[PDB]
Amino acid sequence: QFAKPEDAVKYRQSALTLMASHFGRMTPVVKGQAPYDAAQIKANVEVLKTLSALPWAAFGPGTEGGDARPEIWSDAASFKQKQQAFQDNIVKLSAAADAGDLDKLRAAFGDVGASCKACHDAYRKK
Amino acid sequence: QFAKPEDAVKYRQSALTLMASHFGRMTPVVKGQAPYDAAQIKANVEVLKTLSALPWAAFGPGTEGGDARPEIWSDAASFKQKQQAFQDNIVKLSAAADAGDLDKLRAAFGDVGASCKACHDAYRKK
Ligand code: HEC
Numbered sequence: 524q525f526a527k528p529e530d531a532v533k534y535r536q537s538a539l540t541l542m543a544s545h546f547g548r549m550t551p552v553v554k555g556q557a558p559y560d561a562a563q564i565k566a567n568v569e570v571l572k573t574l575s576a577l578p579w580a581a582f583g584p585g586t587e588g589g590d591a592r593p594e595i596w597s598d599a600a601s602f603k604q605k606q607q608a609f610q611d612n613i614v615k616l617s618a619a620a621d622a623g624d625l626d627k628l629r630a631a632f633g634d635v636g637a638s639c640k641a642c643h644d645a646y647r648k649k
Numbered sequence: 650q651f652a653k654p655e656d657a658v659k660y661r662q663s664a665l666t667l668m669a670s671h672f673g674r675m676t677p678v679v680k681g682q683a684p685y686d687a688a689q690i691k692a693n694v695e696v697l698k699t700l701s702a703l704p705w706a707a708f709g710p711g712t713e714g715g716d717a718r719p720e721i722w723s724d725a726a727s728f729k730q731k732q733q734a735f736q737d738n739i740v741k742l743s744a745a746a747d748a749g750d751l752d753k754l755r756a757a758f759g760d761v762g763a764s765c766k767a768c769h770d771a772y773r774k775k
């Protein structure tokens with residue numbers, strides 16, 4: 524599916540756009556500005572869980588480009604920790620959504636949000 | 650998540666790009682040009698199943714734009730049949746992948762492929 528480095532860029536950008544939508548639409552619920560519907564959130568966090576695993580296979584060998592910094596590949600043990608933290612947080616998010624526990628959800632939502640930013644600060648271009 | 654019609658366009662384009670990748674990467678397997686690994690295909694068709702439900706919520710009221718024809722909304726009972734056929738085919742695809750049955754997979758892959766094209770012929774711009 525990633526014939527040239529550009530195809531990898533196009534895929535990973537599309538997956539990240541969809542995780543942003545699926546993550547970002549839950550903001551009003553975790554802030555108490557919308558009613559919490561536990562089954563709907565459980566379904567939406569299942570979509571997000573699936574989407575959250577996809578970008579990372581499109582950052583393989585030789586796929587520099589986009590708004591990706593080069594340090595993704597020159598500091599790859601570091602990048603990998605910034606991806607694992609984020610996928611670790613998605614596990615948390617799922618555990619709270621599956622339990623129907625809003626306070627835990629709200630907590631795991633903020634862990635997720637911070638890990639998004641920590642990777643962007645270090646490995647995404649302005 | 651779709652504040653303006655453009656946000657709906659951007660989301661639906663990203664979801665369709667990812668379904669194309671996840672659908673299109675199985676071509677060599679269904680054509681016998683790559684070995685069939687039933688568990689890996691089962692996992693990939695699970696990703697595709699999840700992705701295949703997403704575009705359609707971003708074609709709601711008042712989200713004309715992109716390479717979407719207007720007839721999506723002026724002939725909406727017709728568009729809806731072209732989406733149901735495609736989602737019906739994804740069910741088939743999943744049933745074969747979950748069974749590990751390559752011939753049925755290959756058949757359901759071609760039903761999927763045709764339904765992609767039938768909708769594009771009728772409701773996507775050149
Ligand atoms: C590294 C471990 C990252 C984590 C965790 C997250 N993102 Fe990110 N994101 C990353 C990179 C290197 C890039 C640029 C990709 C490129 O090749 O251009 C991005 C990009 C985005 C985008 C823009 C997509 C586009 O349309 O071009 C968005 C909307 C985005 N990222 C959102 C996002 C969110 C919401 C995350 C947590 C849920 C997140 N990213 C995590 C690197 C990393």
Ligand code: HEC
Binds near residue numbers: 732765
């Ligand atoms: C109608 C019922 C459709 C079915 C079934 C499929 N697609 Fe399609 N596709 C449709 C439209 C109306 C559009 C244009 C969207 C816009 O607003 O621009 C598309 C677009 C695509 C694209 C381009 C995405 C982009 O990057 O802009 C691709 C790669 C695509 N569609 C692929 C695709 C595949 C592989 C399908 C079956 C698995 C499929 N689409 C079904 C309408 C419909």
